[PDB]
Amino acid sequence: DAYEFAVDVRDFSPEDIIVTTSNNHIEVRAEKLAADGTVMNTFAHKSQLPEDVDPTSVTSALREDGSLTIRARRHPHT
């Protein structure tokens, strides 16, 4: 089984969407610029992964409905 959550990136461009991970957190972040290029819109979704989720297995899939799907596999205890 894997661990996944969704992010709302509907009004942003793929270039500005960024996924930053580390030992126990994932950080999705985007920002939409105007014609000139001034930031008119930005957010930052910073998650706190469980201890069994491997942060190096994080795949990301943008879909046509404007939702970003973060996905990481977990090695549960046995």
Numbering used by the authors: 85 to 162
Manuscript excerpt for this entry:
HSPB7 is a member of the small Heat-Shock Protein (sHSP) family, and is expressed specifically in heart and skeletal muscle. Though it shares the common architecture of sHSPs (an α-crystallin domain, ACD, flanked by N- and C-terminal regions), HSPB7 is unusual as it has been observed to be oligomerisation incompetent. FLNC interacts with HSPB7, also known as cardiovascular heat-shock protein (cvHSP), via d2417–20. Our work therefore shows, structurally, how HSPB7 acts as a specific molecular chaperone that regulates FLNC dimerisation.
Given the nature of the heterodimer between HSPB7ACD and FLNCd24 as composed of two well-structured units interacting with nanomolar affinity, we considered them a strong candidate for co-crystallisation. We were successful in obtaining crystals of the complex, which diffracted to 2.9 Å, and solved the structure in the P3221 space group. The asymmetric unit comprised a single heterodimer, with the interface centred around a parallel pairing of FLNCd24 strand C with HSPB7ACDC131S β4, and the donation of sidechains from each strand into an adjacent hydrophobic groove on each monomer (β4-β8 groove on HSPB7ACD, and C-D groove on FLNCd24). Note that this is a different site and mode of association to that observed in the dimerisation of sHSP ACDs, which occurs via anti-parallel pairing of β6 + 7 strands. Specifically, the HSPB7 β4-β8 groove accepts M2667 and M2669 from FLNC, while the groove between strands C and D accepts I102. The interface is thus mainly comprised of hydrophobic contacts made between the monomers’ sidechains, with additional stability conferred by polar contacts between the chains. The protection measured between HSPB7 β3 and β4 (residues 90–100) can be rationalised by the salt bridge formed between D100 and FLNC H2686. We assayed the strength of this interaction quantitatively for HSPB7ΔN and HSPB7ACD by performing experiments at a range of FLNCd24 concentrations; the instability of full-length HSPB7 (some unfolding is observed in the native MS spectra, and we found the protein could readily precipitate in vitro) precluded reliable equivalent experiments for it. This allowed us to obtain dissociation constants (KD) for the FLNCd24:HSPB7ΔN heterodimer as 6.7 ± 1.4 nM and FLNCd24:HSPB7ACD heterodimer as 3.9 ± 0.9 nM, significantly tighter binding than we measured for the FLNCd24 homodimer (75.9 ± 8.4 nM), by >6 kJmol-1 (see later). Bearing in mind that HDX-MS operates at a resolution defined by the enzymatic digestion (and hence unaffected residues can appear protected simply by being within the same peptide product as residues that truly are), mapping the protection from deuteration measured onto our structure emphasises how protection is highest near the crystallographically observed interface. This also shows that the C131S mutation that we introduced to aid crystallisation, but was absent in the construct used in HDX-MS, does not alter the location of the dimer interface.
